[PDB]
From a paper:
[name] has two biochemical activities, a protein–protein interaction with RhlR, which increases RhlR transcriptional activity at target promoters, and an esterase activity. Curiously, RhlR function additionally depends on the metallo-β-hydrolase enzyme [name], encoded as the final gene in the pqsABCDE biosynthetic operon. With respect to RhlR, [name] is required to form a protein–protein interaction that enhances the affinity of RhlR for target promoters. The effects of the [name] [name] and [name] NI substitutions on pyocyanin production are not through impairment of [name] catalytic function, as the catalytically inactive variant, [name](D73A), remains fully capable of interacting with RhlR and driving pyocyanin production. These results indicate that [name] has two independent functions, catalysis and interaction with RhlR, and it is interaction with RhlR, not catalysis, that is required for virulence. Moreover, the RhlR–[name] interaction is essential for [name] virulence phenotypes, and therefore, of interest as a focus for antibiotic development.
To test whether repositioning of the [name] E280 residue underpinned the inhibitor mimetic characteristics of the [name]([name]) protein, we engineered the [name] substitution into [name]([name]) to make [name]([name]/[name]). We determined the crystal structure of [name]([name]/[name]) revealing further changes in the [name] active site. In this case, the presence of an alanine at residue 280 eliminated interaction with the iron atoms, and the loop consisting of residues D275-L281 was disordered. The remainder of the loop was ordered and its structure reverted to a conformation that was more native-like than in [name]([name]). Consequently, the removal of the glutamate–Fe interaction via the [name] substitution apparently unblocked the active site of [name], partially restoring WT activity. Indeed, whereas [name]([name]) exhibits reduced binding affinity for the active site fluorescent probe, BB562, [name]([name]/[name]) displays WT binding affinity for the probe. The catalytic function of the [name]([name]/[name]) variant was greatly improved by the “unblocking” of the active site (34% compared to WT [name]). Consistent with the repositioning of E280 into the [name] active site contributing to the increased stability of the [name]([name]) protein relative to WT [name], introduction of the [name] substitution reduced the Tm of the [name]([name]/[name]) protein to nearly that of WT [name]. Nonetheless, the [name]([name]/[name]) variant remains incapable of enhancing RhlR transcription factor activity in an Escherichia coli reporter assay and it does not drive pyocyanin production in [name] PA14 (respectively). Analysis of the [name]([name]/[name]) structure, and the surprisingly modest conformational changes that are apparent compared to the structures of WT [name] and [name]([name]), suggest that the structural integrity of the G270-L281 loop is essential for [name] to interact with RhlR.
Author numbering: 0 to 274, 282 to 297
The structure:
Amino acid sequence: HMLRLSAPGQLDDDLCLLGDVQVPVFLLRLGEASWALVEGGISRDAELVWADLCRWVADPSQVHYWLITHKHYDHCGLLPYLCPRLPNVQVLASERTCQAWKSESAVRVVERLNRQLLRAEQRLPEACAWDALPVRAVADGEWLELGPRHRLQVIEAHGHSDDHVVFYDVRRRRLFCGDALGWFDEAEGVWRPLVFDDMEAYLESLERLQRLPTLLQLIPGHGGLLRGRLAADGAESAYTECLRLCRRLLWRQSMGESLDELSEELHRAWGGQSVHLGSMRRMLEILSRQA
Ligand SMILES: [Fe+3]
Ligand SMILES: [Fe+3]
């Protein structure tokens, strides 16, 4: 499809997709000898992403920044395994996100969730400690002056998770929106809501994101790059789909349906491309809590 770039490699003059489109890691050419990464992947992809990186970047000492949208296992799983190979990298994440990496209970869930994704033959690279990562904490509204042509603004976007942020390149009308709009469904071309924390904050984040200057490029945490109207209308559409799901929880519960009976229907309907179910229930619980 032409409103959506989902192939590994070059997406724009300054931007490549590395690794798997479902859990991509984006690469920004900041300058002749200066690069940046955006989104932190899953752990098992450490060697794939590495191999993909080294095809665009001769010296990895040139990777200076790694931007992280939130703490979930599928958006920072690469950090302990590839940061040691990127000696000059500096990891930029929100205050709450950095605290997750200091929590031992939280780190243990990240590691366990990622380990369920390792293939039979494979083991992982040698790794940093999670509290040893070269990290600089960023705050809502901060400007990340990454290079002469790359200037991104950090925007708090809680709701998907209580730590979530997005990164706006206003020069390029390019939003790295993480999971804040949900999961884009390539089969039907609509967003699927990902509310795993607070529904009001999720809707409020989308309200603010809609007020951004018209997007040209919308880059979620999964699925690749969205352009044209998919980007322009992204935040409004995601907001709409979320409401749509609320009204359907309401409806089906007014007809005596358990959360599970709809947890199954939603898992059956969308879980064949985000492959969870236990996550699927905490969302339906969260939404039915606040309405
Ligand atoms: Fe997430
Ligand atoms: Fe995710």
